[PDB]
């Protein structure tokens, strides 16, 4: 009966992490406290269960600029009393497009979460994910 879902909006941040921030603003979703966005880093669930989890991530970069290796993004899960762990991951190869060329990334997948479970999107260089409206989002809905 109680729908549990959450769509949160990307939020840039001076902090130092490869873990992306999110804000409960704009046209977002947060059906209730049965799902809660804490620390602006992850989404935590209070009810065990199956959930469809996703994160849309577009970023803007350059071939040689950071060049290095690709730009991988990963949907991570951190269950209580368990070490972290990776659920999904997408990865593209920096375009040349100067100054930077955007590129998008998308990852879903159904999972079973233990009560207290909590997920977070993490990328290789947040200093370059794109935050224009509608670009980078993250969220989950329970079946």
């Amino acid at each position: 009966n109680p729908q549990i879902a959450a769509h949160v909006i990307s939020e840039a941040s001076s902090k130092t992490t490869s873990v992306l921030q999110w804000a409960e603003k704009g046209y977002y979703t947060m059906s209730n406290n049965l799902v809660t966005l804490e620390n602006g880093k992850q989404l935590t669930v209070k009810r065990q269960g199956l959930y469809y989890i996703y994160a849309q991530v577009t970023f803007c970069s350059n071939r040689e600029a950071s060049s290095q290796a690709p730009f991988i993004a990963s949907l991570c899960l951190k269950s209580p009393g368990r070490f972290e762990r990776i659920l999904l991951r997408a990865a593209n190869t920096h375009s040349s497009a100067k100054p930077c060329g955007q590129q998008s990334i998308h990852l879903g997948g159904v999972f079973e979460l233990q009560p207290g479970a909590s997920v977070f999107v993490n990328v290789t260089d947040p200093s370059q994910v794109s935050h224009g409206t509608g670009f980078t989002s993250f969220g989950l809905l329970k079946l």
């Epitope: 840039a12 001076s14 409960e24 603003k25 704009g26 966005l37 930077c100 200093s127 794109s130």
Partner: antibody, heavy 118, light 112 residues
Framework: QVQLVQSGAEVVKPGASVKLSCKAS????????MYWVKQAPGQGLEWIGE????????NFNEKFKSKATLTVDKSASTAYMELSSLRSEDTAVYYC???????????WGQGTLVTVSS | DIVLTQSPATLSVSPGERATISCRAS??????????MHWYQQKPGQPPKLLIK???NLESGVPARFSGSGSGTDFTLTISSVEPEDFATYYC?????????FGGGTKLEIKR
């Protein structure tokens, strides 16, 4: 001290184009989105756009998508605004300011008076 | 675009008088943990100076008289007891979405 030093005032004839610059300092340049705000005589504060300097990536207020062109010189820790095809109502003071997590805009350049007249 | 309406447009207070301006969102801009509202004071000739961010936290350096509250669509900013320097004009501004947009402004005039 964290400071942003905007360029000198500009007087320009309609239809021309001007390229405003803003030199940040006192902090890590690439770690802040640099915004731009226009304030016209009597007219209020208007947000033009945003530029991540690390990136080159930008985002404009639709209402100005045509007038502005945000760009930055990561190396020189500087951002630049290029207003083009200036009508007369384009006259005002253009402020470059450091957004703090793209929310509160916490530091501003002196401002640049762009006055466009024949 | 969200539209913020401040009020009064002019608030005439004397030094030693407490003053509180109010802002207004055409829509809620405060969610479950934060209210994306900020206030600036701006003097003639100068650019705005950030005083309060996220509806109620003093920016670094702002003096304690300055304070702010509110949520959803209404917010206030209030100096506990006006001081000469305080006379200026104030803008409230959100950050709920693109484009951020500023309120009309309120001048904090000197009663006399």
């Amino acid at each position: 001290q964290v400071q942003l030093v905007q360029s000198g005032a500009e007087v320009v004839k309609p239809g021309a184009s001007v390229k405003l610059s803003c030199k940040a300092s006192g902090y890590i340049f690439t770690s802040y989105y640099m915004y731009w705000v226009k304030q016209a005589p009597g007219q209020g504060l208007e947000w033009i756009g945003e530029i991540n300097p690390s990136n080159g990536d930008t985002n404009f207020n639709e209402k100005f998508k045509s007038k502005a062109t945000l760009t930055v010189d990561k190396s020189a820790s500087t951002a630049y605004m290029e207003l083009s095809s200036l009508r007369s109502e384009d006259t005002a003071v253009y402020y470059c300011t450091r957004s703090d997590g793209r929310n509160d805009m916490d530091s501003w350049g002196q401002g640049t008076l762009v006055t466009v007249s024949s | 675009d969200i539209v913020l309406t401040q009020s009064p447009a002019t608030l005439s207070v004397s030094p030693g008088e407490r003053a509180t301006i109010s802002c207004r969102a055409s829509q809620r801009v405060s969610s479950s943990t934060y209210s994306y509202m900020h206030w600036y004071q701006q003097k003639p000739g100068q650019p705005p100076k950030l005083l309060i961010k996220y509806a109620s936290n003093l920016e670094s350096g702002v003096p304690a008289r300055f304070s702010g509250s509110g949520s959803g669509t209404d917010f206030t900013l209030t100096i506990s007891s006006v001081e000469p320097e305080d006379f200026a004009t104030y803008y409230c501004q959100h950050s709920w979405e693109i484009p951020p947009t500023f309120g009309g402004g309120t001048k904090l005039e000197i009663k006399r």
